[PDB]
């Protein structure tokens, strides 16, 4: 009943799941980061960050929104 998932968009193409893991690990313990695939297996330009605890979600919003990764500011809409 607790939603511990963040949606993060506008990722630059070089951003990886391990990269986001380490980055959002600063805001709180991260369980997994998934970057979904396209119809041809292409990685999408957004990712799902799943935290261990719900409280990590609002904190990560303030700490990490707009941070530039490879010149592209991430957009945390969740």
């Amino acid at each position: 009943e607790a939603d511990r998932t963040l949606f993060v968009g506008n990722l630059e193409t070089k951003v990886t799941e391990e990269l986001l893991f380490e980055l959002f690990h600063q805001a709180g313990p991260v369980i997994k980061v998934k970057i979904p695939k396209d119809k041809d297996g292409k990685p999408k330009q957004f990712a799902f960050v799943n935290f261990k605890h719900e409280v990590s979600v609002p904190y990560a919003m303030n700490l990490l929104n707009g941070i530039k990764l490879y010149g592209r500011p991430i957009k945390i809409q969740f």
């Binding site: 951003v15 990269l19 600063q26 409280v55 904190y59 990764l69």
Partner: protein, 39 residues
């Protein structure tokens, strides 16, 4: 949990020139200790 300690891959992604400058610690001091690390 060591705040502002990051790998070289992340430093290049963040564009950090100087590795001794801790990133994210300045604002954590304002926001407070990340609640998800307390538990």
């Amino acid at each position: 949990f060591k705040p502002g300690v990051i790998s070289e891959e992340l430093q290049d992604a963040l564009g950090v020139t100087d590795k001794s400058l801790p990133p994210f610690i300045y604002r954590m001091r304002q926001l407070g200790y990340p609640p998800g690390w307390l538990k």
